[PDB]
Ligand binder design. Structure first.
Ligand SMILES: OC[C@H]1O[C@@](CO)(OC[C@H]2O[C@@](CO)(OC[C@H]3O[C@@](CO)(OC[C@H]4O[C@@](CO)(OC[C@H]5O[C@](O)(CO)[C@@H](O)[C@@H]5O)[C@@H](O)[C@@H]4O)[C@@H](O)[C@@H]3O)[C@@H](O)[C@@H]2O)[C@@H](O)[C@@H]1O
Ligand SMILES: OC[C@H]1O[C@@](CO)(OC[C@H]2O[C@@](CO)(OC[C@H]3O[C@](CO)(OC[C@H]4O[C@@](CO)(OC[C@H]5O[C@](O)(CO)[C@@H](O)[C@@H]5O)[C@@H](O)[C@@H]4O)[C@@H](O)[C@@H]3O)[C@@H](O)[C@@H]2O)[C@@H](O)[C@@H]1O
Ligand SMILES: OC[C@H]1O[C@@](CO)(OC[C@H]2O[C@](O)(CO)[C@@H](O)[C@@H]2O)[C@@H](O)[C@@H]1O
Length: 487
């Protein structure tokens, strides 16, 4: 049957990682060049969190983004009255001169008085990546260098080719958002190098990441602004080009979509490279009440599952995201695809499904970890189609990704009774009106990829062990090479 079944998530996720207890907050991926793998520290979130002492740094290890190994608690919160009562995002770097990993992080004071610093950067080190010792005498207060007392967080650490260590910190100078730069030769003495970049208008870029890839410098960052809540980027051929993008609010977007790389279900993305590939890790939020259509009024729930994506540099230096090769390989078992139900103008024809304005086709039940591929050809580039999940033959409501070629964007929406728009993901519509679609699922977390242009993370409770559906809202489509694979 293709009746709606009441699926639920396992405590843990193995690919779009979540530990057995708690959720994955802001990650901090780092390629450990001694062990030759990625150590992804992340802020461990719990439901609920302590009031003052929350968000310790746990870690997980992976070579490839598909299989993870948990490392447990690495840097504990401080005491209730310490400056690092709560811990916020930071940045690891290995120092070969003393054979110590250094993790800089945000210490978050509980109930800071007016004079006290809410947010201060602090550090721990480790010889193996297992035992971490806090440096109880190191504090980097923005205040000291003319920056903000309470917004001063998310230290990012990188070494240029000159060998100099740099640290970028999300802050404000008299109201306006600035990314602050500090430099050091030895990771211990730090000097202020002024402002690296301005933040546009009244925006606030959390979790900044700066890296070079081919012949381009990039800034990745997550936008705090309530209406955005998406991972964005800028680019420049030189480091001075990069900085110039936001200078005086110059708005030099890297592409036709403001550099928005995904939508509001992928936040806090930061990157790391193994020499071959550069991946990005963010989190896919939970939803209140496990309700796919409750996406928050101002903001999504903070933290959820870890989501690895792969950076695709195009030849104009523009970036999009696709799947990690190792996640694609994980799906070994082919599954029969078969129509369980039709509606309106819908024709099957050997192994090709043709749908017109208002038509629907529902396929057989998915499994728990799914890969879904298919090619869609539209009539025009004003056509609209839908990829729907948790859609049983008895479901009055369900959740679809709408691809609206007229509006040059995909949307996540609730369909049926109580339909509603939720949010969207601008991408480049194919000229040839062909859409090579690929979707990867671990339980309730999935990413949808089209034509190496779209990368759309979504939280979809109960997509597992439930049917899925294609439809056509406008014009006409033709669906081809439909496959489903599992593990
Ligand atoms: O009241 C505590 C309670 O709130 C949550 C759920 O939102 O956590 C946020 C809480 O975590 C901290 C300490 O680890 O670190 C946050 C790290 O995450 C980043 C990027 O996501 O930003 C914070 C995130 O929080 C919001 C919450 O709505 O922060 C709003 C808050 O930010 C300030 O600017 C000061 O933090 C205030 O102006 C404002 O009232 C959201 O808009 C942001 O995206 C990184 O930037 C950061 O390192 C704290 O900074 C934060 O308060 C629960 O998990 C927890 O139980
Ligand atoms: O209400 C937000 C909703 O808009 C939708 C619904 O249609 O839009 C978000 C969507 O819109 C863009 C389109 O570019 O921009 C959003 C802008 O909102 C803000 C906040 O007000 O813009 C103000 C506006 O003023 C300029 C000056 O010519 O600037 C002055 C500027 O300088 C400062 O003084 C500080 O230096 C600031 O305080 C002032 O704001 C204009 O250029 C500027 O555009 C800006 O932060 C954004 O411009 C998209 O970027 C965004 O995705 C819906 O999605 C939202 O819910
Ligand atoms: O009421 C939602 C309904 O609005 C539309 C109207 O065409 O789109 C979204 C609208 O919001 C932005 O994302 C940013 O302001 C823009 O991309 C766009 O102008 C529909 O698509 C949706 O179905």
């Amino acid at each position: 049957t293709a009746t709606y079944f009441q699926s639920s998530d396992e405590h843990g996720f193995s690919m779009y990682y979540k530990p057995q207890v708690g959720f994955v907050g802001n990650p901090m991926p780092f390629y450990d060049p001694v062990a030759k793998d990625f150590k992804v520290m992340y802020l461990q979130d719990y439901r609920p969190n302590p009031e003052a002492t929350y968000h310790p740094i746990f870690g997980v290890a992976t070579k490839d983004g598909a299989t993870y190994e948990s490392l447990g608690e690495l840097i504990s919160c401080g005491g209730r009255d310490e400056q690092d009562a709560a811990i916020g995002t930071g940045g690891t770097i290995y120092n070969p001169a003393d054979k110590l990993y250094y993790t800089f992080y945000t210490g978050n004071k509980f109930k800071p008085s007016s004079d006290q610093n809410a947010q201060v950067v602090m550090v721990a080190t480790s010889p193996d990546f297992k035992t971490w010792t806090k440096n109880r005498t190191f504090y980097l207060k923005g205040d000291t260098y003319g920056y903000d007392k309470n917004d001063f967080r998310d230290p990012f650490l990188f070494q240029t080719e000159d060998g100099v260590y740099h640290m970028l910190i999300a802050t404000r100078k008299n109201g306006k958002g600035h990314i602050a730069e500090f430099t050091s030769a030895d990771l211990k003495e730090w000097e202020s190098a002024g402002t690296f970049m301005t933040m546009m208008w009244d925006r606030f870029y959390e979790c900044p990441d700066v890296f070079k890839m081919g012949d381009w410098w990039y800034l990745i960052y997550s936008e705090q602004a309530s209406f955005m809540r998406k991972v964005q980027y800028f680019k420049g051929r030189t480091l001075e080009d990069l900085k110039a993008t936001t200078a005086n609010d110059a708005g030099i977007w890297p592409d036709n979509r403001e550099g928005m790389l995904d939508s509001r279900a992928f936040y806090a993305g930061k990157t790391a490279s193994d020499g071959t590939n550069r991946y990005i890790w963010g989190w896919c939020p939970t939803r209140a009440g496990n309700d796919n259509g409750n996406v928050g009024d101002v903001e999504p729930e903070w933290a959820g599952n870890l989501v690895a994506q792969r950076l695709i540099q195009h030849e104009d230096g523009t970036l999009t995201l696709g799947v990690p090769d190792a996640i694609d390989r994980k799906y070994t078992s082919a599954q029969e695809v078969k129509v369980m139900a039709k509606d309106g103008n819908m024709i099957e024809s050997g192994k090709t499904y043709t749908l017109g304005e208002g038509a629907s086709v529902i396929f057989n039940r998915l499994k728990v970890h799914n890969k879904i591929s298919f090619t869609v050809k539209t009539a025009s580039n004003t056509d609209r189609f839908g990829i729907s999940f948790v859609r049983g033959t008895d479901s009055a409501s369900w959740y679809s990704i709408h691809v609206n070629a007229d509006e040059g964007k995909a949307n996540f929406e609730k369909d049926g009774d109580d339909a509603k728009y939720l949010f969207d993901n601008k991408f480049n519509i194919p000229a040839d009106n062909e859409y090579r679609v690929t979707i990867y699922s671990d339980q309730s977390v999935c990413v949808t990829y089209i034509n190496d242009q779209l990368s759309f993370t979504n939280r979809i409770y109960q997509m597992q062990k439930n049917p899925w559906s294609l439809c056509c809202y406008k014009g006409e489509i033709t669906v081809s090479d439909v496959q489903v694979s599992t593990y």
